[PDB]
Amino acid sequence: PAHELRYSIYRDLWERGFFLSAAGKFGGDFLVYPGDPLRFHAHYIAQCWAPEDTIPLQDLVAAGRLGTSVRKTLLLCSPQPDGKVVYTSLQWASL
Amino acid sequence: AHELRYSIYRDLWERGFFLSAAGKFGGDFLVYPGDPLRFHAHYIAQCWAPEDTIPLQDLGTSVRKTLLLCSPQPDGKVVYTSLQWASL
Amino acid sequence: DAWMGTHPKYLEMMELDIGDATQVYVAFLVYLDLMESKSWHEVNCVGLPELQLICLVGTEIEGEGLQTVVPTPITASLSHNRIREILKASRKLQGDPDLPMSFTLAIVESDSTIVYYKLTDGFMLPDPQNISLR
Amino acid sequence: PEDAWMGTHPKYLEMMELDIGDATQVYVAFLVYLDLMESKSWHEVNCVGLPELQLICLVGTEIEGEGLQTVVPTPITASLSHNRIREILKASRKLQGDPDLPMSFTLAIVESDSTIVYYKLTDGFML
């Protein structure tokens, strides 16, 4: 549609290093931010999961021993048959 | 994949986050909290099919904001045109 | 008033035989604004028949280089493609291919007032690192 | 194999008597119990059976007086859906006694070599 239009642009802007905000109104303007002023801020590493999909923990153990996931927050994101989406933060814990 | 990823993008957009979902990150994408206090210089962008006529009446610009026209071409490449209030 | 109809610069733009009387009038309006109100060093009109456009190619200050001004009535409309075409035409006219393609769009409202907009290929923020309130 | 002695331990037998899970599940629950009490210095660790979820979890006070945390021992090869995680979050809140923090539990992932990696999972957006 005119809805493939926005995808191609969004992807190209992403590939070029920009950040997109307020880009959910398909029919409206969106915002395009230079990456460099923003990227060094705290952020999530986010992941799209169908709610029934199994998330292989083998990668989360590689992260654990190589010290790769320590100061990081991973964001699990799943939309429900509700229409809503549910969010779980996942952080390495020292104990 | 796709319709399912964009349902999350739009929810994060509606909550005020910045997103980057470049192909570099594999299936992952990066999510940054919005800042309601600070204005960061940015483009206000528009998606246009290359042939659609844009009405010139449908036209806010300064050092921190620029209007950005975007159109994908047949060859998969998108072209960008910045639009700025001129001080003549 | 009607005196515009016989002004030599108006008549020279019409001998381009590009577009109709309003496109000539709009381009004449902007020519007068650049040369009278904004005090440009020199303004020349050029026709490009393939795009059916009257351009003003000017030098704002005697030392600097050429820039392309494109008058258009507020009523007109442009595709992004057409804007790209004007960018590529401006690159020839300004002779500056080492710089991003650009031109100035001179939009004439119905009451004849002129607002100017600079259009540049690519990503132009005057200060991409700027941080301000709100 | 080298660990058949753990079947004698009273907290192993307590976990096994929950009649939840196979030997790998009971074993990794027991391994996490030992880690929390010896490799950390946890005050108390209690085991609790959630048979609806067919999960054993450990509920404990990392420090005396401090609130209770839920630790969910899991082999490296288990299957975890996001939906399953949400159900563990909801059950975890009941075991913690519906406080005021957002739902969270700790997932204790156990590799075949008995290394344990701990991840905190929390409802929503943390950092």
Residue numbers in the entry:
A (entry chain C): 215 to 309
B (entry chain A): 216 to 274, 281 to 309
C (entry chain D): 37 to 170
D (entry chain B): 35 to 161
What does the report in the manuscript say about this coordinate set?
We re-cloned, co-expressed and purified the proteolytically characterized fragments, which readily formed rod-shaped crystals in space group P21 and diffracted X-rays to a resolution of 2.1 Å. The asymmetric unit is composed of two domain-swapped TSEN34 molecules, each binding one TSEN15 protomer at their C-terminal domains. The domain swap is brought about by a short, structured N-terminal α-helix/β-hairpin element of TSEN34 that is liberated to hook onto the neighboring protomer, presumably due to the truncated N-terminus of the molecule. The two TSEN15 and the two TSEN34 molecules in the asymmetric unit are very similar with average overall RMSDs of 0.37 and 0.50 Å, respectively. In one TSEN15 protomer, an elongated C-terminal region (residues 162–170) is visible, which is stabilized by crystal contacts. TSEN15 and TSEN34 display the typical endonuclease fold with the latter harboring the Tyr247/His255/Lys286 catalytic triad as also found in archaeal and eukaryotic endonucleases. In the interface between TSEN15 and TSEN34, two structural water molecules are found, which are coordinated by hydrogen bonds to backbone oxygens or amide groups of Ile110, Ala112, and Leu114 of TSEN15, Ile269, Leu271, and Gln272 of TSEN34, and the side-chain oxygen of Gln272. Furthermore, a YY motif in TSEN15 (Tyr152/Tyr153), which is conserved in eukaryotic endonucleases and archaeal α4- and (αβ)2-type endonucleases both stabilizes TSEN15 by hydrophobic interactions and the dimer interface by hydrogen bonds to the main-chain carbonyl oxygen of Leu274 and the side-chain oxygen of Ser283 of TSEN34. The imidazole group of His116 is central to a hydrogen bond network involving Asn117, Arg120, and Asp157 of TSEN15 and Ser292 and Thr302 of TSEN34. However, TSEN15 carrying the His-to-Tyr mutation engaged in complex formation with TSEN34 similar to the wt protein, and no impairment of catalytic activity was observed.
Introns of human transfer RNA precursors (pre-tRNAs) are excised by the tRNA splicing endonuclease TSEN in complex with the RNA kinase CLP1. The human TSEN complex consists of two catalytic subunits, TSEN2 and TSEN34, and two structural subunits, TSEN15 and TSEN54, all expressed at very low copy numbers of ~100 molecules per cell. In humans, TSEN2 and TSEN34 are each predicted to harbor a catalytic triad, composed of Tyr369/His377/Lys416 in TSEN2 and Tyr247/His255/Lys286 in TSEN34, responsible for cleavage at the 5′ and 3′ splice sites, respectively. Here, we show that intron excision is catalyzed by tetrameric TSEN assembled from inactive heterodimers independently of CLP1.
